[model samples]
Target: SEVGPALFQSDMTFKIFIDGEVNGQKFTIVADGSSKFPHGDFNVHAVCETGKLPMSWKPICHLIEPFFARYPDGISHFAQECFPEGLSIDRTVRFENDGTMTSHHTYELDDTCVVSRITVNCDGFQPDGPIMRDQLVDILPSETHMFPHGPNAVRQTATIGFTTADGGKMMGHFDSKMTFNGSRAIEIPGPHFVTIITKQTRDTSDKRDHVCQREVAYAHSVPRI
Candidate 1:
């Protein structure tokens, strides 16, 4: 849950775009790369597109994990504020009768949406080994509502009025945008958001690599039920 524009996006194209001005300094970070669902230790590339700010960040400014600071500021006090004891992946990787899975759930700042990235591999069995059969989110009731974006993307935006901690009138905006590459999509109900306590089939595609097909993505479905 966040007070401003927030987003959770997935695809082979690992991409991130964040821009804003905090205290007179202009912060803009633009990053894009192969999320490595198909294949790298050194594939995802990021660049700090501005000089006003000393540094930019990676995996979308630590939103991937271990970090969620904006532009470069949040990094300063994250350790003290987040885990005085420190941060570690308390990952739970499970292997069952059918297959295996992992969970890296977390939460963060209210000014922005806390985001995490999960990499699932269905590589060994076949090309594009594990194609998704269906996807769904168990959304709770709230003000949030889902809106589809053009072609393969969806955009959600909300503007709210409230008084800040210091008695200042403010209009808060929360924007979330998600996009996919092929004939596929994900729809979660509401402007309201809670933990993404649910599922989306494991992701990856490489037809020539015997990847399920010569498809950028497999035919998939999302349930509104």
Candidate 2:
């Protein structure tokens, strides 16, 4: 299930353009980062210019988990480093509407997929009501944006499940989609409380084309009653 070559093989930066609406307010997220794969180190700064942000920094790990899960052996070195031994990521999220929040993330191996558990400590963090949630997509603005608009933009989708409880219900989830805009540079889609991007041509800055995959994730948290 390997999609493409190792991303950020060398040192590279990806521009993230995410647009979405929460409650009734529309928002936008702009982020840039330098990533070095396998070695497990990435520096990124993301900001939401419109709506209040939720969760800790859990989405960061959630974004990369599917990549490792799909390319367990062929594409992920970051997961390989944490497999069996495990890896933890500590992140600080600064919200434009709210203030700031912190997140602690842990990752491990579960059969063929990478299992991620994220615990957040944020003030006034409200969990979604009891119901199935929408998909959370992670759009990486990099060379992958240049791939031909076809099957090249690989898609990986999965359902979020729970372990250790029978009465618990899946209250929320995240989904993702990656598409090449022959006329633009970057775009992302978000659902529920996630980030989303629209197709805008004014944002295309880089001309280098890279193969990219879109991963839609349903991140599971505390089971609902």
Candidate 3:
């Protein structure tokens, strides 16, 4: 139900700090952008310390209060869902520019925190002017998968950052259920062509906060540290 909303749906916002390398040469690019439906924009700032060096770039709904009032219980009950089992998003994202900056970024929610990772490279080539980087997070690709669960990702979800998937008895299925629902699995080929940043954190807020009446009415989850 609510899980059906496009992850890149309008008004959705993203903030990324991008840095890494292309063939051992490192570079830095930071981006923060928000969505305007099927497509969006990114405000990207890039710095490539050349030496052969080169590089590039890089939530959920509220329990909406009013929308529920219109849907009735059967339709509204979906909002009650939460992803206690955790969630992972494995997607290949792009920015608009020259010498393609294909970065692999993943954000996993595990136990009240979002773990993040990003890799940048100029393995390929874009456009508005020479030596110019866009400032609004461009919506290059809308392909994303929140594996192990849907948008109501569990509070304890932890994403798989920079890892290889082992062949199968496949822990994700049995009767079985799929943990993630997304697009073609990406391959960041050719011997770690880029530098990677790991063990960082992501701050996610869709800006539709304070809309959950039941959640706020109680405000009472007895938050523990």
Q: Evaluated with lDDT, which candidate comes out highest?
A: 2
**Local error of candidate 2 at residue 133 (angstroms):** 15
Cα lDDT of model 2 by residue, 1-225, tens digit:
121232223344445444433333344555544444442234444554553343322233333232222122323222233334344554444332232335454544433333444444433322442111212222221111111123323232223322112344331232223322233222222111212221111122344211222333221122221
Judging by TM-score against the true structure, name the best candidate: 2
Q: Estimate the TM-score of every prediction.
A: 0.24, 0.33, 0.29
Taking the tens digit of each residue's C-alpha lDDT, what string does model 3 give over 142-194?
11111223333211111211111232110110011122223422211111111
Question: Model-by-model lDDT, in order?
Answer: 0.26, 0.32, 0.25
Taking all chains together, the TM-score of candidate 3 against the true structure is: 0.29
Worst 10 residues of 2 by lDDT: 140-149
Could you list the CA RMSD of all candidates, in the order they appear?
21.7, 17.3, 18.0
- Of the candidates numbered 2 and 3, which has the greater TM-score value? 2
Model 1, span 1-225: residue lDDT tens = 311112212123334444433223454545443422221121333444564232211011122222221112211222112321122222222212122222222333322223223332221111121112111111121132334444433343433222223443333233444433223222222222111111112123422110010112111123222
